[PDB]
């Protein structure tokens, strides 16, 4: 069984000048909290440890880009980091990463805002990401797929009950996942580049996430 009330509690349980080094510090910090979040999602902690590792290594960036984007809904043209720092669009642009930052804004934050995506809905989206059965090396893909199926069935039923006037809302929620996937990848390419040029500090867990597998 996969109750939305539990996913929601997961969410509530973990809530808190190169703008880039601030952004990267926030990410490293929230990688620790992501572990705490994942353990509160039903059945995750029951999977084999190696699979838990695979799901987190494959999903972390998406999982955490979804989180700070949802937090930023009430921010005009910027993002709110878990540190408390607001980062404006103009400062991302001034630091050479304006284009990627705008895509977070336009494809994620603003669409979350326009639909007023709620915290249960976020949590379900992020559970869906976490239970990614395409993740390579999973000892049993079918099982993760099944956990995913139960999350999206509970979400569908949450949407139909809570927002019965909006028959499309469910689909619309899932249709943010392609943008999330691409924004995650494009942000990883920037990070691999920061690491390479070696300018920007990257803290230890962030760095570990940027290692090759094994």
């Amino acid at each position: 069984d996969m109750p939305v009330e539990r996913i929601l509690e997961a969410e509530l349980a973990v809530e808190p000048n190169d703008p880039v080094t601030n952004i990267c510090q926030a990410a490293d910090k929230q990688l620790f909290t992501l572990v705490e979040w994942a353990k509160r999602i039903p059945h995750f902690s029951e999977l084999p440890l190696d699979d838990q590792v695979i799901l987190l290594r494959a999903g972390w960036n998406e999982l955490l880009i979804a989180s700070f984007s949802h937090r930023s809904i009430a921010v005009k043209d910027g993002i709110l980091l878990a540190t408390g720092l607001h980062v404006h669009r103009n400062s991302a642009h001034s630091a050479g990463v304006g284009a990627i930052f705008d895509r977070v804004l336009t494809e994620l934050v603003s669409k979350m805002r326009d639909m007023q995506m709620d915290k249960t809905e976020l949590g379900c989206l992020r559970a869906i990401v976490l239970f990614n059965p395409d993740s390579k090396g999973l000892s049993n893909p079918a099982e993760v797929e099944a956990l995913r199926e139960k999350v999206y069935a509970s979400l569908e039923a949450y949407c139909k009950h809570k927002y019965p006037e909006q028959p499309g809302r469910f689909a619309k929620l899932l249709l943010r996942l392609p943008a999330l996937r691409s924004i995650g990848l494009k942000c990883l390419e920037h990070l691999f580049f920061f690491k390479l040029i070696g300018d920007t500090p990257i803290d230890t867990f962030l760095m570990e996430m940027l290692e090759a597998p094994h």
Partner: peptide
């Protein structure tokens, strides 16, 4: 994967 393992329990 060291840090992640340790945090996972």
């Amino acid at each position: 994967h060291k840090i992640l393992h340790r945090l996972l329990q």
